[model samples]
Every structure is written in C-alpha cells, then in structure tokens.
Target chain A: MASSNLIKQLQERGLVAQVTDEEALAERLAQGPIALYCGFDPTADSLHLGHLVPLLCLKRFQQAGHKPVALVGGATGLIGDPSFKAAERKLNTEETVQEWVDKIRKQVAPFLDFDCGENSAIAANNYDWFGNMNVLTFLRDIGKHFSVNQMINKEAVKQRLNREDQGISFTEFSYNLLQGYDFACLNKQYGVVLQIGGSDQWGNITSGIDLTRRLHQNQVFGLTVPLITKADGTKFGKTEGGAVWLDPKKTSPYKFYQFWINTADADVYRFLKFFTFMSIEEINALEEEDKNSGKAPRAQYVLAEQVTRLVHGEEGLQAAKR
Target chain B: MASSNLIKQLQERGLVAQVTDEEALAERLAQGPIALYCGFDPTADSLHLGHLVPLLCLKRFQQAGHKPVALVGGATGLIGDPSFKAAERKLNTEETVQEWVDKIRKQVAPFLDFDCGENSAIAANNYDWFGNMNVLTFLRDIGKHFSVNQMINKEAVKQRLNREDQGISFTEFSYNLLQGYDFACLNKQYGVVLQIGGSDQWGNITSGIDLTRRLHQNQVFGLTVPLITKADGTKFGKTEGGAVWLDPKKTSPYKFYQFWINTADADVYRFLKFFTFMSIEEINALEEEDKNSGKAPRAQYVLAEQVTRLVHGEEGLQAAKR
Candidate 1:
C-alpha cells in the first residue's frame, strides 16, 4: 500500500492518462523500491516544456524512493518514432544525432540526482546496444514479435496510413519495434519494471510491456501522462518565437520563465500541478488566493519560478528574475 | 529492331509473362549487348525445378550474346522476400544461409559459362555490399524512396494483408526495400540494365526499376517469365520425394532426368523450347516427329536429355540414361 502515495498524488494532479492495472501495479510497487524508466528521443537538440510532464513524473517517483533511469533514444533518433507526427521525419545523420545525444544527456540530468547513495539515478543511451546489432538478428528475434496489422492500428500510424498523400515510410514504421526493443534491453540491463511516457505513447509503451513479457517472461508495467494542453486552443509549448526549449542558449531562462508566467489564467493552476512537485493543498491555497483577490499574477509567476529553477538551476533563476 | 528476334522467340515460347514496356526494352536490347541479371534467394540448400525457368532464361540471354550475371541473395536471404508467400518465413541462421549460399553458387554456375570470351557470365553475392553496411545508411538513403501505400498495393503484399489467420511481419514486409536496394547496387557495380524473374516478381521487379531511376536517374528494364504450370491440375515440379532439386544428393540426376521425361505430351514441346537451347525450328520438328509417330515419346525424351545434359553434364546424363 506504500506505493499508493505516488498513485494517489498522480491521480489528484490529473497526471495519469492510462496505466496497466493500477491495483496490481500498486501492489508490486509497494513490495519494495522498484526501478522505472522513461525514454526521450533527441529529435531536437534540447528538451522543451512539452517534455516536462513525463520528466517531472519520473522525478516524482524518484522522490518517493524508487530508482529512475533516463534513457536517451540515440539509436531511435536515427529511425524517428512515428508516435503522433503528422508527416514522416527527415532522418538525421549519425554525427548530428550523436551531438544532440550529448546535449540531451546534460539536459535530462538536472531533473534527477545521480550520486544519491542507494536508489541513485542513472542515465543511458540506446546506441550502446543497438549500434552493433546486425539487421538479421534484429529482424528475426525482436521484430518477429510484432505484426504489421497490429502496428498499422496504432493511432499515429493509422492516421498517416489513412491519409491521401505523404504516407509513412518503412523506416518510420519500424520505429515502434526499435522502441520496444529499447524497453526490453532496459528491463534486462537495469531490472526496470515500469515505463512512463506521454499519453500519445500508450501504444508504444504497451508494445514494450508485451515484448518484455514475451522475451523475459517478466511482469512489467507502463503508465502515460495526459498530454499537456493550453486552454486557449493554441499548442502549449509553441509560439511565433518557436518552441520554448530548456537550453538557455536556445530559449534563454528569461524567455523560458516568461513563457510560463504568461500562461492563461484558466490553465495556470493545472500547469502548476502537472509540472511541479508542489503538494495539492499548497497549489489549491495559491489558486484560492489568486482567484479571490484578483490582485497579482502571483500564482503564474510561482509556477514559472518552480519549473524554471528545476530545469535551469538557482543561478539561471536569479538571472531570469533580474 | 534487331533485338526483336529474342523478344519474338520469348513470346512464341510462352516465356514472356510480364515486361516493363516491350517496345522500349526491345529498343534498349537492340542498342548493344547490355548486361542482364536475375537474383535467387538461398532459402533452401539447393535450387529446385521451380527455379529453372529464370535460370535458363539468363542462360538464353547469355547465348544471345548479352552478358549474364547470376546474383545470389546471400544478404536478402537473411531477410526473406515476402513476394507470393502465403505466410511469413521462418528465418534461417547466418551459418545455414552461408552454407546454402555456397551450394547455390555452384548450382547456378553450371547454367551459364563463366570462362567464355566476350559475354562471359559473372557470379556475385549481395552480401558483398550489404554485409558491412550500416543500418542507418540503409534506412535513410535507400529506404526513403519507398512508400508504404505503394508497397501495400503490391499483389503479394495485398493478399497477405487481406488475410485473417496470419498477418505479415515487419521483417518480411521490409523485404521489398532490401531487394530494391540490391538492384541499385547491381546497376552501379555491374552495369546490369535488366532483371528477370517469375511473373510473381512483377511488383518487386518494378520497385527496383523505380528505385534505380530515383537513385541514379537512369532507365532500366525488367522482364518476367510465366510461372510454370502443368496442363493437368497438378502443381509443376513436385514428386512424392518432394521438390526436384538441382543438387544431385537431394534429387539424383536420374530423378531429375525422369521428371522431364515424364512431362505431359501436350507440354513437352513447350518445355524443350523453354528449358533447352533448341532453336524454334528444331523444337517444332521434334513436336512433328512425336505427333506423327504417336508411338515413341521422342519429344519428351529429347526434353529430358537436353535439360539433363545442361544441368548434370554429359557424364551425369550418361549415368541417368544407363
């Protein structure tokens, strides 16, 4: 029942979009500290606010005494994931992906601690395993578990396939299998029993769970966070200035903070609970204060400060404030 | 116009099943002695009677003074071709496929002369190009040209997708892209301008033409032989002992000769023209002799002796007669 603390918090914050048997997962998690992971593909050179919910969710689990492993999808970046993209991706070269991989490893490190004694966090790249793999073994062993029909039914793939023009490629269609293989490798290498991702990742996450079961005969779990949306009908993390990236050089701590500070009054409270580790009672109190008095944009500023400090450190926060 | 001789002969013998623009291909063949090729996957340890039509077709082109190249699908065998298959293939081990590749090379060498002066045949393996290839390069550069919609529309893929009990695997589904890449490689390395296969390969053959055009901005050609079928309702090239294999150990030279000798009377003259180097006039005369006598199976015995001598050599043919 001890793991119910994390589950209850996730539910209260409206973070969980789907999970594999909540009660069973709670029981398993309650048994002891469990290892869980979430993978991030380096499609870009930096993490953005769009990626914060799942990264913060992993942090939340780390705070609750579970181990966290951040997987950088170095190999998968070469074969882009077609999870929810409308069009096929232009593939990046190995050198470009390698450069982004280094940048991403640093960006993700700030979200979780590495040197804490017993359940310390670890960072890994999928290239370490997939780089040397022969195409035959990959097709025969890992690829045999997937069916083209089942893959075609995934919402992202289905949408592209059902379109009139610019359909998916075999390279992108194969992305799901590579991601599934990543999870299986992580499970074997790190005993990772759970994977977390955005709601759009539900199909890919479940694929990994099924693959792990088939390959290792191990019971694993997966949970996905709700897609973060802005109430104003615009995409949450994009503006005319382009995406609000976590790298200070790209978006700057000032612009990063301003992006959060300017959140819609209707969406600020939800963003706070979704992106910060603040308790529900404290967030509710701030909501009550801002709604009743109608004096300052204090709650939005706090949301900006908390998220910015976590991603950019105290020095960056101080610079943004100045 | 000069190349019409071969085209007319092919049409008369019922050898031409499908062609990518007969007029253009005939014009191209008339230009000079262009190199042509056909690929055989080492799915089994030895070539079978089912493989004889295309093998002999290559020899026919060589005999007409065009260069012939026999491509062993050592790399493609690692990823099985899904064309015309009712279900997905079971993958063979690298060691097993390697052993089969060596045996198939020998089996195919006898069909075309390698030491003849000007238009001498050459034997090559796809593994020469694909073995050291990086998977990323394969997907990004070569795979970008293929579309999922076009691939799904292929007759072989359409039948598999429309099935209920078993669906295709991603491994088998991607087999088209590999074969297309094989053609591009061959065109670059061997100057092969034409490829021929069974009628079932119309889809895969055209895919290679499209790929070669896109990659090199060059026009190439493809031709398909009709899948050999018996006039009776029985399947061609099978016995109680299984397939009539080219390997003597699998099906002895005697069995191979008898398989031809046992051809139906109505189909024997056609087999002689298709499977032997006999001129159209010679085959027609043989047909007249058998029909006029109606006693001795002269056409069937001639078909047997010619095909057996070609596949098994003079010594083996003598032994078969003995």
Candidate 2:
C-alpha cells in the first residue's frame, strides 16, 4: 500500500471523522513522509483511554513512514481546553501542570518510536514557545486573525455561553487562538503540515489551518477522529472510580488490560480496529469466530493483549497476564 | 475647600458621569492622599482636546493632595482600544507605538507637576509590566479573572460586535481583560485605588474594579467624566479639518489656541469649568461676564489661554497669542 493509503486504512478502522481537503491532503501524503501533530493538554497527571484513539492514530502514521509529533500542551494546560466542556475549568498551578506535562510525555512515549531516523517521532511542548511570549504580541500577531463573531458561533462556546449556570471565561475563550497559533508555529519551526485531534476539536483544528494560511500563506491539513462511545450507552472511558488512565500507578496494568478485555460484544470488534493494528481480514475473522463460538473470549483476549502490550511493554503485558 | 475634596470638585465641574459606588467613592476621596490613575493609549503621537478631560481629571486629584498616576498605554497601544469604536483598528508596529508612547508621555507632562513632592504626579506605562508578561501567566492569572459574558455585554464591545460591516476581532474583544489587568497591576504596585476615564471607559473601568476584587479581595473605585459634546451637536475637540491635537507640531500652538477660542457661546462656560484650573467662582464670574457683554469672547479667551498654557507652556501660549 502507498504511504498515502493511510486514509483508506483510517476509514476502515472508523477513525477519521473529518478532513480539511481530502484530495489535497491525499496528494501531499502520497508525495512522501509528512509531519503531523496532535496536541494533548496535560489536564491530569495521566492520559486516559479517551486519548488512546488519537495517540494510536499518530502511531499508525509513524508506521507508514510519516513523522508523528505528540504535542504535550505544557503551556495550554494552564488554559484548559473548552471544546465541548460544560463549564469553565479550575486552573492547575504552574508546578502542577508541569508535573502533569512530565507524566503525559512519559505516558505516550512507549506508543511511538522516538529514534527511528527518517520519520522519527517528535515530542513537543507548546511551553517551549509560549513560555517567553508577551501578552501584547500574542494579541497583535495571532488574536487579530480571529473574529469574535465566528468564535462565538463555535458549537461548544455557544453552548457554554448560552447556559445560565456555566458562563465561559476569557481564559477558556482565548484557547482557540492559542491552539491556532500552535499549528502555525509548528509549521514555521518544524515544517509540520498536518494536525489531528478528536472530533470535538474540529473547530480548533480548522482554526489552526486558517491561521497557518493567514500567517504564512501556506497550505496545511486538519483531521479529527470520531469520539469513542460505548454501545451500552455508558461513557466510553469512564469507570465508577473515574477515567481509565494509561499510567500503571493510576490504573494498574491488570486493570488497563481488564478495561479492554471487558468490551461488550457489540463494541469489541470495532475496538479491535480502533485500538490495535489488526488487519481488516484478521478482525473480520475474529468477529465471525466469536459469533459462531459464543463462549470463547478469543476476540476479547486478542484486543486486551495487543493494546496492553503496545501501551505497556512486553514485561508489563506479562505482568498483566499473570 | 479642603484639599481632600476632589469628589465634590469633580461633581461641581459636571465631571462625574458615572461612579461605581457614589457614596463609597465620595468617602474614599475625603480620606486624604489616596492614589488614583487614568490610562491613556499612545494611539497617536499627540493628545487631542478629547483627552484633556481625563488628563485634567488627574490634575484635579493632584491639586486635592492625592497621588495621580498618568498611565501611558504603551502595551495597549499595540492592541488598540476598541471603546466605542465603529471598526477594528489597523495595528501599529511596536516601533510606531513606542514612538507614540514617548510623545504622549511628553504631551501630558507640563499639565501635571511631577516635581511637586507628596502629591507629585507619576507617569507610568503598562509596557513596563506587560513587556515581561508570558502569555501563559497572562491567560492563567489575569484572563481567568474576566467572564466572557460580562465582557461581551460591554456597550462598546456590543456596539462593535453588532455592526453589519464591522465584526470585532479577538484582539479587540480581549482588550477589556488587558485593560482590566492594567488597573489591577497599578493597584498592586502603587496602591492606586481609583481609576478615572471618559464615560466611554465605564465598561473597562468597571472591569478593572471587578478584576481587582477577584484577584485580591480588595475594593477599588471607578469614576468617569462625561463624554465631551457641543451645543451644536458636533463632537467636541473636532474641527472641520480633524481633531484639535495638543501636540503643537501636529496642530500648531495657534491651532491649539484657536480650537479653544472657537468654542461657541453655548459651550465655552461649561468647557472652562471642565478644561481649566480656574476656580468654580472664577468660572461662574466669567460666564456672567460673557452672558452680560455678549460682544467679547471673554470666556473663550481665558479658556484658550489657560489650556494652551497648560498644554504648550508659557512660551507656546505667548506665541499663540501673537
């Protein structure tokens, strides 16, 4: 398959929800290795299963010889992500956000290769650029490019602002411009040409694409993956205790494996496609075998083992099995 | 009159257009030697007669034995003031704004005595603090203090946002928070408890008060002078040519003198009270003289002489009289 053939792969796995310009992006990806990034705010001390789909998407790109940059939102963590959020977030202190930044960087490290020469994975923190940025320059150079009318109309912002109890704050409202500038900065500094995030981030992703064009007159792309959901109508990544974390300390390797192993029959096959690098034919065969046998935990075991091994290492996977 | 009687003086001059808490502010003013500040944007290299109202308000407080800080908006100049503006501002370069900052600082210098110990005027620029501010700290610490709902409801912002051809930019929309933070910064650094501006700044002024309370649980005060207008319904300080600039080079001393001398019979008495250091009794006596004679430009002459001297100095005033 061609390196650009990942879009078709993404479609089969039900990963891609939106693309900026299908034809242009396809052409660019076909040209050769391209650099792409997805930003994850260190809002907590660990990456949850909700973040796994997109991080895995980055890994898939790395597998196809494209550069994958996992951007840890060290700067942005101080300004919480407001997309689809119901209310303004209580801010984390600089020290706390920095600690989470370190944890998140460690959390995603095992999933993507950092030393594989041609298209080696890159880990970036927006704090590197924003740490020294003066407020006046940010508003003049970046904020001038966004219109308040358009910003107010974004679905998440509208919903939050229109609610009686949960009004948005200027800190959260300005998040889009900060995120948009991040893409432009990455484009200028690292030649990054594509940005991907969850579907709720479509508005922010497109904003970055617009910012890149406005600032540098350069063409770039945005892609968003579907929000993970459960067939049982419960939330995708939450348990009674709270979110399912990727860190062993927060969520033990055994529990992390159990979270995947317990996927409902209706959602298991789809989870295999999204969470693991299983071939289409193999996933289809597993689905058919599970439907026929009905008692064996074959599909579930395969999903749990593959994901656990990838997120944790071979030793962690053995520990989880024991 | 007691030197601590600025509020009463302001009221007699018809300068009190709005006050956050009329009784509380009046009480604060009576408590001797409080610090107050009025911010001026370095949008141009000159101070127009339109700026004279607030600049003179600072002088009034100083005359009342209060510390008056004249804040030059070196930082806010880079992010233009959107107050009551019909359209978004075209950005000026840092060099351009810095040049204007120097010009404005010089322009307002002669009006307030910086050498008068105790109540000597202080000239400060927001750039001093904002220049070193990281965007993360600004958003996390300062921006978090503002609610987007309250900001969007501000009359100036709402008016601009509601216009058909003019949509407010994020830069302008975010302006209130910056100005608000300026007040908080001034308050923290200099114990500036009072903020004054033209009535158009009521929104931003109040926003600063709100920010101060939120950040430090401190009570502050806000006061606004009425928007200057003429009996002919033309804007005050505007000629058929344009604004009546205080910078003699921009609008010559003769022009500056002419701008005041041209004040109509219906407006001169009120302007004399507002623009000059002439006592209430002196101004009233001038109004009586002008009303009785009806032939000479008595009030206009005194008005022109006093303002021109204050703004351009005795030499320039003498040159204008030539």
Candidate 3:
C-alpha cells in the first residue's frame, strides 16, 4: 500500500550502517508490513537533537507501511549501559528514573501515527516485565544462555577490561542480557521483527538478535544508523551553547531552528538526508543546483525549515521565522 | 575459657591451610571466643569423608569455646558454584535441592554440640536471604561492587576461559556475589568472623572477605583445610567401590571404618593430625613405638575409631568393630 523496498530507500539516503542480513530483510519487507522497534533509554528529562536519527527512523519505517514500537527503557536505564561509554553513570533514584520514562514516552509519541490500521505504531516500557522479576529466575532461565568467556571478549567490555581505574562493574557487565531479553520479550508480545539503533549500539543490538534466535526460535534482524560526522570532522550536533533539546522549554523552538540553520556548508546537505523525510531525488537536485548555479543556497534554510517543522508545528516554525 | 587459643590448637594439628591476618586472628581468639561458620552446599543427600575436615572444624572451634554455625547453602545450590570446577554443574530442581538441605542438615547436626550455654553450635541457611531477593536490587546494590576485570583473571575462571569448549556460564560466573553476600549476611546476623573451607575455596572465601568489608564494613577471616592427598600423590576419600559416605545406609559404618583403616603408613600420621582430637603427644608416641619395636601400630585403628565414632556415634563404632 505504501512505498516498496524501505531498505533500498534507506541505503540510498545513508541510513543503513549495518544489517544482519540485507537480502533476507528486503525480501521479508516485500511480502507485507512487519512490526519493528527502536529503544530509547531515558537518560535525561528531554530528548536532545542528538536523539533524532533513530527516533525518526521509527517514523521512517511507519511511513513505509510497517509497525513501529518506541520502547522506553525504564528498568535498563536504572542499571547503566556500558556499551562504548567512557565512564559509568551515577544510578539515579527510582523515582527520578520513572519520571523521565513518562516524559520520554510522551515525547516519542508524536513522531509516529498510532491509529493507522494494521501498521499503527505503539509505545512500550521494559519495566512492565522486569519490575517484579525475581533474581533466581533471571539467573537460571535467562543467564544460562550467556557465556562470560564470550562476554569478556566483546568490544564494549574489552575496552573496560584493558583499564584498571576505569574498570567495568558486574552491574554494567550484566546489562547485555537485560537488553537481550527485551528484544525477545518484544518479539513475543508484538511480533517485532527488526530492531534499529545507532552505531554505538551494534554490540547490544547483535546481542538481542542472537537472543531472539536462541530464546524464541525466530530469526530477527538488526540495523544501525551511522554516527553523523561533519565533512570537516568534529562532532555534529553541538550548538554554540550546549545540547539542543526537543522540549521547547529547555531549548526554545526559535533557538532550535537557529541551531540547524547555522549548520556548515559541508554538513547541511548530509543533515538534510538524515533529519528530514524529503525525497532523495529532490535532495540530489538541491546539491546539483548548489554546485552549478551557486545561488545563496536554500540548503541550510531547507534543512532548518524541514527539521523545525518536523519537531514543532507550522505555527511554531513561523514563530521561529518571526 | 574453653581452651586458651583455638588458632594455636589448629596450627599445631595441621588444620590451617591459609589464613587471612593470622596474628590478628590469633589475637582475636586470645582475647575471647568468637563465632565462625562453615558452608556445606547440598550437592548430595549425605556428607562424604571429603566433607569431614570443614564440618569437623566447626566442632573443633566449638570445643575451643566459640559458637559454630553449620551453614547449608540451600539457595546457592540452585545456581551452581563455578569455583575451581572443571565444568558447569547441572542445575537441580528446587525440590531435590531442598531435600538435600534437610538431609544434610540432620547429618551435620550430630557433630557439634548444640546444648552448650555460650558457644552452642547453630544452624543457618542462605535461602533466608536470597529466596525472596529482587533482581533489580541485586544488580544495583550487591552487584555494583564486583569488578569483572578482576573476576576474569581468577584461578577458577581463568582455567575455563583458556578453553574453547569448557566455558563458564554467566549464571555460575555470577556465583561469586551470592556467596559474598552470604558472608555479609552471616556477619550481620550472627557476628560470624571467620569462614572455613577447602583450599580450593581460597578465591571464593577471599571474595567473601572483601564483600563483607565493603557491604557491612566488617573485617572478617577465612581459613581453608588442605585437600586430602596420598603420600604417593593420588586423590583420597574414594573407597574401593565408590565414595566413602557418612550415611549408614549408603556406606555402612563398618565399611566406613575399613576405608579409613586401609590408609597407607605414609598417610596415616598426617591423617591422625587432620581427622581427630587426640593429643599430638599421644600420636607422636605411637609413631615412635612403631619405629622402635616395629610393633603392629595402632595409627589406622585410632584414626578409623575416632572418625567413625565422631560421625556414627559409639554404638555405630561398636557395631563396626563387631
């Protein structure tokens, strides 16, 4: 009913960083609509500009006639994820974490349509499953499949193993299985077939894929989006001040628009494909015009206008323009 | 005071293998009687001759005017300990494990006197702490202190990591904290200051010491008995047919006596020091008499008679003699 070959479309726009099996996923998508999910851990009160790629990817899938599930990690965020992190996080109180989960769930809801027939999107929180779970049940049933011999050799863990002062604790080392079981539970509950995450999540995502197969006998797929980089090569999302937050109160919509509008010439075209659902052919045409005619180009304006209107409404975007 | 120094008596009898803070422990013992414990995981329905050293070590402490705790590892048996094990153990059903806990508790009761006023031996089970424990509380509080970087390099785990097929599971690898918390709880509940086990338990006991210090801020002690080996260097405790069991039904007290009576001359003198409460002067006199007149020595009979009566009582020892 919608666009065909969602994977092909993503590959063209540079959204696909890694996939478990490309051909199998494309074939699976060709048959009919499938349910997919992306997990967001509530690390803070507001979703920042840095959180948009994977959050928008769920909408990208939903637009192509598939179900999207936005998962808020209420339980896992209680225990910090050590995947590619330089240092461990301070464990916030349960009261504080649950507050962020509710806030994050609401922020994630506006990105995808929940009432759209068979391909409608939904939101879930992992705390529903893990909140009452017993320690022995976790040790005997879920932990039996994981080998510490293999876990220590993982890239995320190996980095910590090589250090003394920054060594990983058993709490974070055990985070792998919790995330792995989340994928398995999601597959059982909603028939979720694919999990999308960022490049830093490759270790955790693949762990879930393996767990989905081992626990459910279902072969699931994982795809990670690349970490956005500037052509001149510094971190991409830093505004002149600090993090650009999605909550209008934290980072106002007007300043949010300026954050995108001030993107450098080298990165603006790339940000266009990553942030906005604008057609790739139209993006290519804009690039060609910018190259050949060299007008005081519309690339930065288009990037800012498209992304601002995506997060804020047309009236909000106009207010930014005012 | 029931015997001036328990540490001095143990060191004289060759009962001490490794001790943490030996002088401090001797000083603590000299000041007054202290409570100590030995854990016996219910691996089988009956305690074997191999279990005698630590089980009887409790009695040795009780005789020296200290309270002894016979700790049954009812909860720990469910998640098998990977300490110095060649491979992971099969997780037994709770019914089977609880049955062994009851059976082993009764068998362990006859050794230490429970009626004495101040230093009466007591019984405890780890299930009281871990049975209703929550997974999140475990991961956040108890698991936060262990470092996987140090865990991987441990003697028991390092051997498994070096192999391709004989690897350790995360369930058993997580066992360090379970036993660690057991000591912490025992310290908090009973003021248990020392834990005794076999030499292979050095790693786990040291982990418990460290955990007790971290969790309860109580500095504790650990002492392990040396593994029983023949003078010609072979494993002990194996009867001609199978294991030398303490239960009269499994291995009759008559047969149990014979197994000890068959000990070679080279191993008999050392067995005397390890297995009985007979004075060292008496044992040395017997050895000298054996050397002087080449007399048919009473070493093995004394060893068998002492241990059989210790486990099976005077009537059982008399039945064995008949």
What stretches of model 2 exceed 4 Å from their correct place?
A1-4, B1-5
> Across residues B122-237, which tens digit of lDDT does each residue of candidate 2 receive?
89999998887888888888887788887888887887777777788888888888789888888999899999999899999998998899987889999999988899997777
Estimated TM-score for each candidate:
0.97, 0.95, 0.96
Candidates, DockQ: 0.61, 0.82, 0.84
Each candidate's fnat, listed in order, reads 0.53, 0.95, 0.81
lDDT of 3 by residue, A1-322 (tens): 2334788889889998998888888888887888999888888987887789999999999888899999999999889889888787788878999999999899888888999898988889999988889888899888998988888888877878887658988999999898889999999999998999988888888889888899999999999998888887777777677788888888888998988888888888888999998999999999888888857778999999999989987866987977
Give the fraction of true interface contacts kept by model 2: 0.95
Candidate maximizing DockQ = 3
Q: Which of 1 and 3 is the better model by lDDT? A: 3
Model 1, global lDDT = 0.87
lDDT of 1 at A136: 61
lDDT of each: 0.87, 0.87, 0.87
Question: How well is each residue in A1-322 modelled by candidate 1, as lDDT tens digits?
Answer: 5546678678999998999989889888889888999999999998888888899888899988899999998899898987888888878889999999999999899789898877899998999978877676677688778888888888868878898965988788888888888889889999999999998898888899999999999989999999888787888899998888989999888888888888888999999899887889999999999878969868889988998899888987888977
lDDT of 1 by residue, B197-236 (tens): 9878888889999999999988889999998887886888
Looking at chain B only, the TM-scores across the models are: 0.97, 0.95, 0.96
Model 2 chain A — which ten-residue stretch has the worst lDDT? A1-10
